[PDB]
Amino acid sequence: MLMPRRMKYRKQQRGRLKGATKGGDYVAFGDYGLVALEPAWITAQQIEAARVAMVRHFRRGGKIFIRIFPDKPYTKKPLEVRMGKGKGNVEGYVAVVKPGRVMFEVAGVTEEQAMEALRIAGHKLPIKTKIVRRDAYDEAQ
Amino acid sequence: PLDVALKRKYYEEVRPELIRRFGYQNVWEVPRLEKVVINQGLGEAKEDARILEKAAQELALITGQKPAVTRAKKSISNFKLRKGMPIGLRVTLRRDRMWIFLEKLLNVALPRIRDFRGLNPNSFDGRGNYNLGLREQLIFPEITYDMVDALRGMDIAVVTTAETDEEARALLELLGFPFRK
């Protein structure tokens, strides 16, 4: 449960997402990598649910590192009030992640630790994903 | 170019001394003096006004110059006067006024100080300057008790050709400048 802090403005429009990711598809940080893969939003619940699965099964292990950051105003409106007035308020602090967008990396474990952790983690997300190693993403700034 | 005590002193002795110690093949690159600043921040001119300017005029009136006051920058919330316009006098000393002032200063404004050991050497720029401020203004010779309101100390400032502490401080030794050493 992290985010920015009421920066500049607080309500911002919806979105349609073809495919580009803007980039950010490599190791650089640590080692073994979990790669997100569909055009959608990353849910905070699923942020720290992935963190759950991780330190949950793998406890007293090594270190895990982040590249991402969940921050989106889920413009939600009150119920049964009949549609119209206003936009809504900043719930569902999701983030914007498309296919091929990687995101999570582990370091200081065994191969299988990564493997299993990434399995259950992928079992949690509002979609699904893939996972790989370290060899051909060298040079990426 | 009216010569005084420390003037001629400075002239001769500092030339061969300085250049035999540091080396300078130039009339105009060998490190010399430059300018001195008499400085007076006393933001009490929130009110009090130019009755305080009477007090302030007294400062450079006795050093012999007509001084220019300087205002404040912006809001000093804690110390009133926001927009910044109280009284923060400063007057500039050229080549020869520097002579009389430095002369007095080094002769009358120092052998006094009750607990006088010398002036702090680490008060240096590293870029060849020496800023120094003092408490009681009334230690000067040309002032006597009946004129003053309180203590109107000043942060005297001096610039030099000096690029490091070395040259300037040695120069000071030559021209009779007290030091904590």
Binding site: - | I62, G64, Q65
Partner: protein
């Protein structure tokens, strides 16, 4: 140092605490004091 309103100069001396004969020129009239 020109202008019209300047706090004056002119000769002044030094009579120390040891019977001195030193020659100076300052802003206020005459001065004599310490070592």
């Amino acid at each position: 140092m020109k202008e019209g309103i300047h706090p004056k100069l002119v000769p002044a001396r030094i009579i120390c605490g040891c019977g001195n004969v030193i020659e100076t020129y300052s802003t206020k009239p005459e001065i004599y004091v310490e070592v």
